[PDB]
Ligand binder design. Structure first.
Ligand SMILES: Nc1ncnc2c1ncn2[C@@H]1O[C@H](COP(=O)(O)OP(=O)(O)O)[C@@H](O)[C@H]1O
Ligand SMILES: Nc1ncnc2c1ncn2[C@@H]1O[C@H](COP(=O)(O)OP(=O)(O)O)[C@@H](O)[C@H]1O
Ligand SMILES: Nc1ccn([C@H]2C[C@H](O)[C@@H](CO)O2)c(=O)n1
Ligand SMILES: Nc1ccn([C@H]2C[C@H](O)[C@@H](CO)O2)c(=O)n1
Lengths: 242, 225
């Protein structure tokens, strides 16, 4: 593809969806692939073409909730689904959007890399996946990204950096029910993984190009109106260096 | 261009044995074995974990099993046989038996809950909407043995992980195989399968006694594909 692929990375409730879905309106050649969180909170699979004419598509379970309620049981399942749903969404947007754009940019809300190296890894490190689950997950992730990764390789990353405290407040502002018991400690562990990966750049992955991918770091701790102008000026300048 | 034939049958019916014999008939015939060794040494033993605690481990096992299968079947297409007269690949089972026999039975036995089963089917539909095409079968060989025969063969083979399997589990798997490949009443969401030809072979007898003739019957079935 000629479509530039930029991932927006950041902790839970940092403000990624808010920022990028406002940002994308500046340019008709800019689209977003949102994170499939609704597919996690209401688990559904495809209906048969005849059955769907007389049967409704039922609300399923909430595997995001299941993970938060018992992570030692449900982390592997959630992480596997999260990543699959994401790859599906990302690949379809590449094949189908911005075909007639002049300078097309697709912004991803998170990546397969944060799925593995931030979230799944932290769960493994906190004994919510055992060695077998962690091996199986990394095998699957490796294999998929050897088939598919080329098409999904990133041209750049925009790291939206917020303190764990800001994130915890923003989880309360947003009101997602299954997130209201998340403790500061968990956000803080995610925070440090993001810093290692994107700020200090010491976190090593199995995808060598990532050590070189350009990264733009933006502080999003202030109220939205207070820095938006400067954020946008930084983003445009960043994009033109790619 | 490669003809793809799955060998299907219950646990210890004699699939690996059969396919290993079949292979030797032609340099242009290869086999994709089920990645069982990988399952038993991930090392953790995920086969054992599923058998000992199936409500805890059945989803994990079914997705790894199917993943491992897809990876091996895909791999074998890319290498060996692209450069043969009539290339044939024999798959030890398929993504269809993984889902519609084994996983489905575990769901019916309440070893996967609704969420796990939905996630599994979504994963399976997507994983095959991408690949599947390259792995579509030209034919199926069903090795039919009774549950009692399969229980005996499990003991002969002596895999530790399997020695606790009750006859009743084998009966459930047998009913699903018969429904899929004999009665043809098992509904899947892959429309092309309804038309794949199936050769059913009774392997209940000691292989000292009817086996070489079963083989010929394959050699010849393959000529109709
Ligand atoms: N800069 C900001 N100032 C005030 N509120 C913000 C800011 N950015 C995000 N929010 C609010 O914080 C919450 C989480 O934002 P959201 O974009 O959903 O985070 P993410 O996509 O990173 O998980 C929402 O309630 C949103 O209104
Ligand atoms: N027809 C047969 N007669 C006697 N033993 C058989 C026969 N087929 C297979 N066996 C033996 O039964 C066991 C199971 O066979 P195997 O090929 O591993 O089964 P599968 O691949 O179907 O699980 C092995 O110990 C094998 O040597
Ligand atoms: N690989 C991921 C991705 C997201 N999330 C969670 C964090 C939020 O609660 C929700 C939406 O980002 O999903 C997660 O646990 N693991
Ligand atoms: N989808 C699958 C495939 C295989 N097996 C099991 C049956 C045997 O015990 C072993 C080798 O076939 O793996 C399984 O439970 N589920």
């Amino acid at each position: 593809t000629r479509i530039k692929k930029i991932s927006i990375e950041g902790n839970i409730a940092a403000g990624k969806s808010t920022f990028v879905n406002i940002l994308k309106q500046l340019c008709e050649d800019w689209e977003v692939v949102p994170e499939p969180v609704a597919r996690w909170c209401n688990v559904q699979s495809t209906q048969d073409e005849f059955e769907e004419l007389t049967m409704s598509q039922k609300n399923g379970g909430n595997v995001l909730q299941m993970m938060y309620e018992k992570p030692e049981r449900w982390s592997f399942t959630f992480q596997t689904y999260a990543c699959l749903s994401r790859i599906r969404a990302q690949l379809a947007s590449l094949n189908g959007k911005l075909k007639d754009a002049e300078k097309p940019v697709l912004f991803f809300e998170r990546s397969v890399y944060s799925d593995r190296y931030i979230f799944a890894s932290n769960l493994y490190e906190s004994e919510c996946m055992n060695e077998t689950e962690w091996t199986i997950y990394q095998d699957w992730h490796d294999w998929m990204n050897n088939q598919f990764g080329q098409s999904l390789e990133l041209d750049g990353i925009i790291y939206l950096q917020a303190t764990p405290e800001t994130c915890l407040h923003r989880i309360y502002l947003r009101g997602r029910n299954e997130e209201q018991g998340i403790p500061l400690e968990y956000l803080e562990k995610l925070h440090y993984k993001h810093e290692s990966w994107l700020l200090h750049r010491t976190l090593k992955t199995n995808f060598d190009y990532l050590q070189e991918v350009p990264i733009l770091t933006l502080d999003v701790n202030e109220d939205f109106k207070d820095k938006y102008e400067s954020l946008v000026e930084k983003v445009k300048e960043f994009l033109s260096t790619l």
